[PDB]
């Protein structure tokens, strides 16, 4: 074998901490605290992090390092009856990059658009504005801010799209920015870990520089502490509600990004006796720690808007791309030395996305390299052909209705697909493979068996955790609608196929593999449930 290894343990730590901390650390976690009882939200968030998140995060890093192979190989190497898990997972990562790179593109567009004396998104008297323009955020739908109109009429031109059917013209300025993103990713992933673990030194460390200069800037504004009150004033009545417990559960799970083959990919290049347990606890903490810090970078200036700009806190305390692309830029437009805070903020967004996307596409090439050696031998050729497909169909996200395209895939293509995949990930290692086997495996690696706490989490609460999250996602389900636009019913049907296409690889491969080996039934399960290492 003789597999490639990280050219330094910090290269692995940086590229994992990088992959783990992203935009959901800035534009989802602080809201939740605010929405769900301030600082009291940390009680269910932490317990759900200890019993449901960190267990699954730790588990995938061990299976990566222990089995020394990519996603599809490891699961076939582990339990062949469920080798489809590697395929479904790789398909999800293959789907995500078709659209979730556009966030790094929008970030690069605001970066390019910030080389100016007065930022554009502050005034209401541009050619792209409407009479319903307001200087700042409000609460009536038909009247938007100058930054909301700037984002949805100049950068997006979404006003020129009647829906998902109406993609309209193609914004060539945006198609260039998306090309730059795929160039940033290539010459950082074509040579592999040699450069990947090194380029991530910039993408994973820069946001902490930006978070610092933006924390001292936000905490020294007139009205910063008022936001810290909103962000953290504890209202322990939330803990009783079940929805907030699920809010804490679903945020904990996705913010660590497991069951996507990335941890399985990055860890496979570790040394066999690396203390992966220590690495799991360290990197996972820094993920939530970066989120705890970001909430101050956000809500300090979020209170500065309520104070000096006279805005309802409810009208600016948002989540998702709205938080980073309209309201926070609108507040930067008012503070002295505005153009500087914009550039460090917008490339904080970019460097947050790149290190995370790195792991996703790396999860693909490692898994495919470990299965098809003539593309393991042609990595810089293969990965040059992957982003080519990405740039082709990725032109849909640069069309005038590109956001309607982005929002549809965001709410179907990878959400539910990754929950049932990890649910089968969790029971394949605990029940089929066995905690006794899995614990015995990492005792060989790190010298000690995982505590009874860790495997009682891998065996019982992990399926309940994922079931709890899926139930609350299905309970609050509605047909997809953005702003005043309701999607057609065929568009909802398209999203479920994208959801099923990956996860169908579990039973479809399980079927195709089952009736492809000889013997009786029970004589066949013992074939498809004996691991590769046990039979040498």
């Amino acid at each position, epitope marked *: 074998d003789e597999r490639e290894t990280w050219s330094g343990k910090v290269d692995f730590l940086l590229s994992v901490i990088g992959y783990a901390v992203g935009l959901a650390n800035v534009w989802r976690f602080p809201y939740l605290c605010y929405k769900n009882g301030g600082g009291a939200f940390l009680v269910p968030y932490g317990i759900m992090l200890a019993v449901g998140g960190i267990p699954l995060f730790y588990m995938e890093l061990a299976l990566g390092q222990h089995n020394r192979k990519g996603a599809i190989t490891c699961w076939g190497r582990l339990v062949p009856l469920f080798k489809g898990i590697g395929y479904a997972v790789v398909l999800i990562s293959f789907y995500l990059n078709f659209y979730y790179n556009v966030i790094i593109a929008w970030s690069l567009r605001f970066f390019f658009a910030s080389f100016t004396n007065s930022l554009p998104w502050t005034s209401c008297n541009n050619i792209w504005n409407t009479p319903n323009c307001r200087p700042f955020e409000g609460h009536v739908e038909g009247f938007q801010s100058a930054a909301s109109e700037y984002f949805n009429r100049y950068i997006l031109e979404l006003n020129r799209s009647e829906g998902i059917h109406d993609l309209g013209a193609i914004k060539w300025d945006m198609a260039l920015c998306l090309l730059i993103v795929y160039l940033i990713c290539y010459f950082s992933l074509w040579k592999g870990i040699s450069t990947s673990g090194k380029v991530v030194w910039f993408t994973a460390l820069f946001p902490y520089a930006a978070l610092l200069i933006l924390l001292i800037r936000g905490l020294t504004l007139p009205g910063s502490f008022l936001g810290i009150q909103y962000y953290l004033t504890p209202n322990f009545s939330a803990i009783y509600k079940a929805e907030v417990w699920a809010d804490a559960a679903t945020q904990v799970f996705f913010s660590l990004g497991p069951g996507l083959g990335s941890l399985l990919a990055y860890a496979s290049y570790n040394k066999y006796h690396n203390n992966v347990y220590k690495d799991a606890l360290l990197t996972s903490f820094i993920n939530s720690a970066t989120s705890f810090i970001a909430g101050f970078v956000i809500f300090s200036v979020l209170g500065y808007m309520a104070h000096t700009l006279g805005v309802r806190i409810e009208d600016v305390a948002t989540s998702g791309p709205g938080l980073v692309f309209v309201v926070y830029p609108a507040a930067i437009a008012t503070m002295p030395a505005s153009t500087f805070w914009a550039l460090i903020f917008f490339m904080m967004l970019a460097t947050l996305g790149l290190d995370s996307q790195f792991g996703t596409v790396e999860a693909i090439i490692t898994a495919l390299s470990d299965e098809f050696p003539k593309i393991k031998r042609n990595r810089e050729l293969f990965v040059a052909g992957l982003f080519s497909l990405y740039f082709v169909v990725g032109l849909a996200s640069c069309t005038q209705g590109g956001f309607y395209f982005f929002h549809l895939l965001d709410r179907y293509a990878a959400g539910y697909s990754i929950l049932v995949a990890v649910f089968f990930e969790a029971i394949a290692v605990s029940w089929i493979y066995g905690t*006794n086997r899995f*614990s*015995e495996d990492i*005792r*060989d690696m790190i*010298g*000690f*068996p995982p505590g009874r706490y860790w495997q009682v989490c891998w065996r019982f609460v992990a399926p309940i955790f994922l079931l709890f999250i899926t139930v609350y996602l299905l309970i609050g389900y509605e047909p997809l609608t953005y702003a005043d636009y309701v999607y057609p019913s065929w568009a909802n049907a398209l999203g479920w196929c994208i959801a099923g296409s990956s996860v169908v690889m579990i039973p479809a491969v399980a079927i195709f593999k089952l009736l492809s080996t000889p013997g009786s039934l029970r004589q066949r399960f013992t074939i498809l449930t004996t691991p590769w290492r046990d039979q040498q």
Partner: antibody
Amino acid sequence: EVQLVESGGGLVKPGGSLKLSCAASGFTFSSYAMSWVRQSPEKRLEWVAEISSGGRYIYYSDTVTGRFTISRDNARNILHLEMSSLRSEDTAMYYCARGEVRQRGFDYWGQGTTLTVSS
Amino acid sequence: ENVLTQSPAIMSTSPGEKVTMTCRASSSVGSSYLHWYQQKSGASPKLWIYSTSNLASGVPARFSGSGSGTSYSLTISSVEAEDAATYYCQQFSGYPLTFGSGTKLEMKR
């Protein structure tokens, strides 16, 4: 509580074979790695072989690899060591030592069973 | 083979006195992997100290361990006659597992 007795032993002609056994008691034998470590009449402790809790990871010393074979029976809770092609340098008291977590060493030791090898 | 030599080979000491014995690995070992075993005459060894300095269950607090890397030591605060034994250091850091040469402790008289 936990206990370990070693069975077998005796004297063998050079090149002969013998199988020692360690009956484990007082603990869940199936979730603890086991190891054989001998010491010669000149009182030199020397580790021989380690077997994982599930028997899927096995390490030997260079001096016994090929000749010796270690095994587990987690049904009857017996640890075994099959010795073949014996040399005189193998005469020693043989200890069956419980040692799962490497950072915490060998928890409990057996009484020891003695092996002689002479013409 | 990480050979570990111990010094002295055999030391006598009056009760109440203090003793120090060393364990010199030929190659560096991690702190969490060196252990110490007391073996009394005509008896099987016993886990005495694990991870350089952590006492096992039963061994009194007059025993202590220290050292790192290639040099380690075992120290008895005030020696008693119930400590007359042979003390073995062991490395669990890499295979093959190796035990020290041993330090025989005897009572002065």
